[PDB]
């Protein structure tokens with residue numbers, strides 16, 4: 001019958017791997033991480049999908065999707081399915097009072113609350129169901145959904161592990177506080193009423209916990225981030241990932257293999273999909289003047305022989321100051337983990353036509369190499385865990401909250417820039433400085449869109465980036481695009497759901 005341990009483990013496993021699956025989906029495409037990541041990244045200023053022919057990619061890239069959007073449905077169906085599983089577990093263990101089950105239920109309610117946030121943040125409403133049954137989910141709009149989420153988190157806190165006391169991979173009170181802080185920071189968006197004071201309060205609780213910032217930014221996204229204390233100390237909520245276990249159906253697989261192509265030095269994998277690369281605007285977060293970006297001159301030819309090894313590739317790049325470490329030095333920021341070297345071919349910073357992977361610089365933030373230099377478990381699938389929740393979010397969140405209230409946010413911003421060994425310290429905080437910092441600190445971590453919406457820059461002219469709105473130099477779009485549409489399939493199946501404003 002009911003396998004409490006098995007169902008509990010699946011609850012967390014759903015965050016980082018696929019068994020919710022739909023026709024037209026390749027390996028692991030229904031994934032919770034991939035679907036949510038694409039909805040918050042592909043339409044942003046952080047990256048571009050190289051294969052514009054793939055279905056619905058042009059729509060997501062340009063922010064011009066419709067209710068029939070395949071990717072919108074993929075993430076909608078996944079978020080919903082996951083919740084049905086959390087409701088199943090909670091119903092099957094109702095009434096149990098043993099210590100572990102109390103923690104398990106608290107954590108499951110946490111995961112459910114997290115999924116509703118995604119619904120809230122992405123659709124502004126959600127197909128709501130508290131229990132597992134055949135009854136059609138009822139629609140729960142913004143503010144009501146907001147209050148429900150905040151209440152869930154407030155009530156389970158007591159039964160959750162203390163900060164850094166839960167097995168690595170499970171959520172604790174700090175994960176609860178960080179999420180509430182996120183809800184508060186976006187309260188104005190979801191309710192129409194801001195609550196920056198509360199955002200600061202909880203961000204502070206997190207900062208006050210045992211969690212500390214990793215001293216080496218890159219280590220947070222490496223194969224051993226679940227064994228390297230320096231990294232573990234900052235990862236409040238990691239999605240466990242292991243080469244031989246998760247294999248090709250995980251999230252970090254998408255992050256590492258997806259941003260690489262044969263020829264690049266230290267691929268960390270045998271299969272580079274050459275799918276994800278940065279938009280010119282992303283590069284600009286580290287180089288206000290794109291002319292300062294280390295690049296191979298056009299008049300310099302790329303040898304067709306003598307560049308088959310990492311050793312040969314690094315030397316050629318070094319000769320021309322285009323190794324990623326040179327990129328970091330030119331940027332004066334440890335987070336400028338970009339690659340403009342010759343590995344994989346001549347790169348462009350900006351393009352006037354999305355034709356291929358090389359039309360932009362490569363992003364090497366995610367790596368399948370251990371900081372301790374020891375062997376990883378697999379040659380193709382990465383061991384790198386996805387640090388979904390990081391202490392750094394608390395700092396940027398409180399920084400913005402403080403700024404929004406009219407206070408001095410310089411301290412929290414310089415705390416992250418200092419950790420990143422930035423040569424430039426922020427003297428005064430501004431809206432632009434903040435939103436740019438969110439990009440620098442969390443780019444390619446699946447949250448960009450949400451931040452852009454809050455700053456009122458996602459659909460508007462307040463901020464134009466390359467390829468935004470389908471225009472090469474960037475153009476605005478209808479404001480109703482700040483919320484994805486309700487998949488037309490669910491509109492036809494659940495008479496309780498109503499389409500979001502704007503869509504037809």
Ligand SMILES: OC[C@H]1O[C@H](O[C@H]2[C@H](O)[C@@H](O)[C@@H](O[C@H]3[C@H](O)[C@@H](O)[C@H](O)O[C@@H]3CO)O[C@@H]2CO)[C@H](O)[C@@H](O)[C@@H]1O
Pocket residue numbers: 026027028029051054248272273274275
């Ligand atoms: O290798 C030549 C092929 O290059 C292009 O295929 C792309 C896909 O379009 C892109 O989505 C990605 O596919 C991966 C897929 O998304 C993932 O679910 C699966 O598990 O791995 C796939 C990669 O093996 O990357 C591939 C390869 O770059 C092109 O569209 C295709 O027609 C070419 O045959």
Ligand SMILES: [Ca+2]
Pocket residue numbers: 223226240241242383384385
């Ligand atoms: Ca791991």
